Amino acid sequence: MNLPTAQEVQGLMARYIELVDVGDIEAIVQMYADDATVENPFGQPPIHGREQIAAFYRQGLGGGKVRACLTGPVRASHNGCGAMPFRVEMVWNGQPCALDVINVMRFDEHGRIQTMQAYWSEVNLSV
Amino acid sequence: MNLPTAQEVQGLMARYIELVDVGDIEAIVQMYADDATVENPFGQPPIHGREQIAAFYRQGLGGGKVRACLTGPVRASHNGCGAMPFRVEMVWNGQPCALDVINVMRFDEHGRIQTMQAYWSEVNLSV
Numbered sequence: 597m598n599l600p601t602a603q604e605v606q607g608l609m610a611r612y613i614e615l616v617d618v619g620d621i622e623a624i625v626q627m628y629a630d631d632a633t634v635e636n637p638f639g640q641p642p643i644h645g646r647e648q649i650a651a652f653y654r655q656g657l658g659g660g661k662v663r664a665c666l667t668g669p670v671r672a673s674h675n676g677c678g679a680m681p682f683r684v685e686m687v688w689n690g691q692p693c694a695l696d697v698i699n700v701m702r703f704d705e706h707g708r709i710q711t712m713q714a715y716w717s718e719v720n721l722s723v
Numbered sequence: 724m725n726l727p728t729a730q731e732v733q734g735l736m737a738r739y740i741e742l743v744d745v746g747d748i749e750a751i752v753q754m755y756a757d758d759a760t761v762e763n764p765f766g767q768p769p770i771h772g773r774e775q776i777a778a779f780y781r782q783g784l785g786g787g788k789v790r791a792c793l794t795g796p797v798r799a800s801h802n803g804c805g806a807m808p809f810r811v812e813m814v815w816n817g818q819p820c821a822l823d824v825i826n827v828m829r830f831d832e833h834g835r836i837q838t839m840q841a842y843w844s845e846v847n848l849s850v
């Protein structure tokens with residue numbers, strides 16, 4: 597495919613959340629461009645490339661029990677970008693906890709994620 | 724003040740929505756740096772400076788009846804930035820309509836909005 601239309605961005609960004617929710621690390625990594633970046637949380641230096649990105653998702657999702665769900669609709673653009681609000685259910689010290697996040701993505705001219713930026717800080721975590 | 728902390732960003736971004744909701748155009752414009760930019764919707768060229776920004780808010784809010792409310796929490800950063808999901812209630816051809824938006828902001832070292840980017844496209848509008 598080419599640069600995703602607004603409707604295609606919606607679909608891709610919702611699919612990303614589905615894949616996080618089901619914990620399919622390999623399928624998530626395949627959504628990214630080979631040389632993509634992830635800034636998590638936004639404010640921290642980017643990681644680069646599918647090896648580093650795979651390591652990020654393995655560290656976050658490797659336990660197999662994380663859940664994630666949109667908390668409202670994707671807001672897409674006409675230039676291959678979008679933003680979405682969601683909540684992640686994780687564990688911490690055996691305590692269930694939830695993290696509220698907004699991801700901002702930009703897709704490349706092949707429909708792959710070029711950049712991901714995850715906005716959140718510590719007060720978005722609730723034990 | 725200086726560059727807003729994560730907690731200060733939350734407060735500022737929530738205040739912005741309150742001011743949109745109450746329709747205080749002049750107070751909104753005062754939140755912006757003198758040379759700020761607004762990209763609305765994201766994907767379109769920025770407007771620049773408080774004159775152009777005031778004209779934007781007068782055109783959107785000048786009728787006095789718009790409402791706006793957060794639909795989930797602000798996601799702030801530790802570098803003076805944040806993102807938030809909200810819904811705007813407007814009128815169109817005398818029809819009430821709602822627009823789902825995510826704003827991404829960056830604040831300057833004085834606590835004023837340096838950049839605002841409003842993510843939405845036409846399918847985020849509902850008549």
Ligand SMILES: O=[N+]([O-])c1ccc(O)cc1[N+](=O)[O-]
Nearest residue numbers: 616636653656657697699714
């Ligand atoms: O904080 N995180 O781990 C995180 C942040 C944003 C995401 O889109 C996904 C994850 N995750 O896979 O867990």
Ligand SMILES: O=[N+]([O-])c1ccc(O)cc1[N+](=O)[O-]
Nearest residue numbers: 743763780783784824826841
């Ligand atoms: O579309 N709009 O008009 C819009 C978009 C984002 C905003 O933060 C505010 C407005 N408004 O004042 O109406």
Ligand SMILES: [Mg+2]
Nearest residue numbers: 613614617618
């Ligand atoms: Mg699921």
Ligand SMILES: [Mg+2]
Nearest residue numbers: 629630631704
């Ligand atoms: Mg490439």
Ligand SMILES: [Mg+2]
Nearest residue numbers: 740741744745
């Ligand atoms: Mg109000």
Ligand SMILES: [Mg+2]
Nearest residue numbers: 756757758831
């Ligand atoms: Mg300045």
